[model samples]
Target: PIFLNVLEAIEPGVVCAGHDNNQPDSFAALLSSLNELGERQLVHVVKWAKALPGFRNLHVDDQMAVIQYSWMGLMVFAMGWRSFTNVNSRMLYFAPDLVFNEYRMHKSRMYSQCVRMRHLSQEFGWLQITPQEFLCMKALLLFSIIPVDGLKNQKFFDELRMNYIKELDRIIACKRKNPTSCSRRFYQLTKLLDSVQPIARELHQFTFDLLIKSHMVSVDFPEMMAEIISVQVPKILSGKVKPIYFHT
Candidate 1:
């Protein structure tokens, strides 16, 4: 009921059509629009967090913990899904209008990573991933654990993690033509998780460079976005004493 409806509402889609490159301020406009797009996407992800059963029911502190730790994984998955729609082009698109070529993109590790990530996403699209497959992939990333200590309810989270794993398996089971082929396909799908990790790391570095290091472009993230994507900021940079530890 509420669960499915929430999922449907938060499913990502392209909101804006591509803009022309002929405008004199095309690069400037793309920067502004891309920042706005990132902010909107971050808000949608918070809405997505609520779609999970018991996600909001957990203690407030625990809720933030799970969201912070899982955010990069979920962000990478969402980014991959978004880029899947633009797979046919020679350029890699971070947004509809923010497309880049290899020579231009390769100059920065950030752009280079985006190109690689889009290629990886295109591979997934070629695998004929279904709606159920995509959702299961998201859930698996969201609930996967890290090595952090001091969780108030690790066992509770562990239960939810196992549930997502089982549900992923169930989706695969229902889709496969037969058991022997099923086992092989299952292994292949789960291995996608392995690729997600390195891409996420690169994506985080790219984000950090944008928000912190890129002097020309002024940027600020929603508080939750900052937490999920960033590690401890020195007091000088953050102006706050408390820092969230990065979970491995």
Candidate 2:
């Protein structure tokens, strides 16, 4: 009863929580940061995170997750991307003529595909607007139903997870190469971004619990979810969350 209400509260139109990170994040300092992402910027952060070399082609949410985990680097990318866009809005507006150059890239021949909308949707296998598929995750949490159970394909699935992460690592690392010119502003904005992931892990628990209750995967769903939460949450909550600083 109370549990289903929580599940229903989630917005299928967006992630369980909206991209704004506006919910009451109660995990750690990370909560404040996610909340700070406001709403619009959170989505943009996901976009920029996706654009980083390895992750650019991934589903949107995965791209965002990588950034969420790597708080420091994501901040730089988000702030820089937005700042660069707003400052000039045109390559030449850093601008010889203040002109919005549209056809400058081509001679008006050979139609070009509309630029693909980049996002962090690829995380954990494109949990798009399909309420049914989203329900799968919920199913796992509630029933402890390992969807892949008895499937005898452990290697394939494990590889799927790791391969995906490794690719994201490559993408974010590449963004480090050409950092934004707005060094001071970038740093400040990054400070804010730095705090999102550690806490997001906590919220993830809430979501995980919701799934467990709804799906009835196993009798130990409650205990298993707690253990999984501990592992997934940032090291800070786990034990010694060393300030693992990196460029991407």
Candidate 3:
């Protein structure tokens, strides 16, 4: 249970979006707040990942690569969980101060993606995901994306990924006395995890395009958010970096 202990210990605390509720909701303002929120979250994510059980085993470059590549999915998954826990899947909880209602979702210009994320949030409740399962699954998400050509230390990455999967299996099997029930639980969890990629992909593309014409639209992207969107995000969009799905 050390893995779960470590996961629980290193889990990042709540982050706020620093949004101004007094201001009217506009595309530019909402996106700027989201970009700022992303920047803030990235700092915590890096610290959390570095503290992970076997993360230091990764080649430094590969470690950065995986984090950059999978950042969107990681954020999406965590946000979905927050929405489920805090709002009962009634809204997208991007941050404590940045919950998105249907109108806000429409104003964000990514309504479709928001709907999908809400569905993802509902799945957490529908599946009755445990805290241990959520932690392990979130950790697995950090390793879910990589360059197709491979990382600087693919073998190490593979081993780390395998160990995380084993940990998830351990967590899943803990309460289930029946082998069939355990397998069914694993199937449901993995399928739910696989479902995150497509939502992240849609958000990636939406943000990428938004960044491209940000100036014209008056939307502002933070330094790190803009950098990753321009550099790493394109690689995924172009099929260079890819997500590893549990199904298909």
Candidate 4:
């Protein structure tokens, strides 16, 4: 009944539903997902995407719109900072050698996913998301992807700062309601979210450089990444469920 209900609301609007077929390119689909258009049409997407091999292999949540996958990818990158930047950013999963600290990952699936995302970028040219960007998506995934109840309590918010906030703001900005339908390119938007590139660009000139050019990550960057996460992820935690809704 719930599936039917979801379909009823979304199926009609999903121009991809039948006949002539109007699905956007995969990258466009990914952007649509992140920008909030996907959730509205998630049910319709499921009908097409669920059985696809590439997506099926991912540890990502199915209920997650294509856009959310980009976020998940970024979180993975941030986790690296967690290992390297502890409180400031480094957080070792297996530190002190004795305890062997680490992430909440259940298996190698998530990393495998990052590799796949990299491939997608090359194969489908997925908006040219960098490896670090992938990590940012995953780091947020670490906090917000977990099972939870209510947007107010997501650890992403109650904890310190990260990169999720800036991305959300961009989404809010881009959600301009025009009847003609949005036609923005997918890859162009990826750099806009973590909400740090502008400063990183300014800093690159030997000023107070915010990004580490060699690494392509923010210098004290994960915190800016964290700030973004803390600000954005809570919007989706509406009940006793994570924003991601993957299938078994």
- 136-179: candidate 4 lDDT, tens digit per residue: 33333423343344233334333322334343233333554653
lDDT for every model?
0.60, 0.30, 0.94, 0.31
Reference-based lDDT, residue 167, model 3: 96
Superposed by TM-score, candidate 2 places the C-alpha of residue 153 at a distance from the truth, in angstroms, of 23
Give a tens-digit lDDT track for model 1, residues 93-141: 6566655556435533356676667766776666777777787777677
TM-score of each: 0.74, 0.23, 0.99, 0.22
Give a tens-digit lDDT track for model 2, residues 16-53: 21222243322322222223332333454445333333
TM-score of 2: 0.23
Q: Give lDDT: candidate 3, residue 65.
A: 95
> How many clashes does the backbone of model 4 have?
58
Which of 1 and 3 is ahead in TM-score? Answer: 3
User: How many steric clashes between backbone atoms does each model show?
Assistant: 0, 27, 0, 58
Worst 10 contiguous positions by lDDT, candidate 3: 1-10
Candidate 3 similarity to native, TM-score: 0.99
Model 3 C-alpha lDDT per residue in residues 49-152, reported as the tens digit of each score? 99999898889999899999999999999999999999899999999899899999999988989999999999999799999999999999999999999999
Model 4 quality (TM-score): 0.22
Cα RMSD, model 1: 5.4
What lDDT does model 4 reach?
0.31
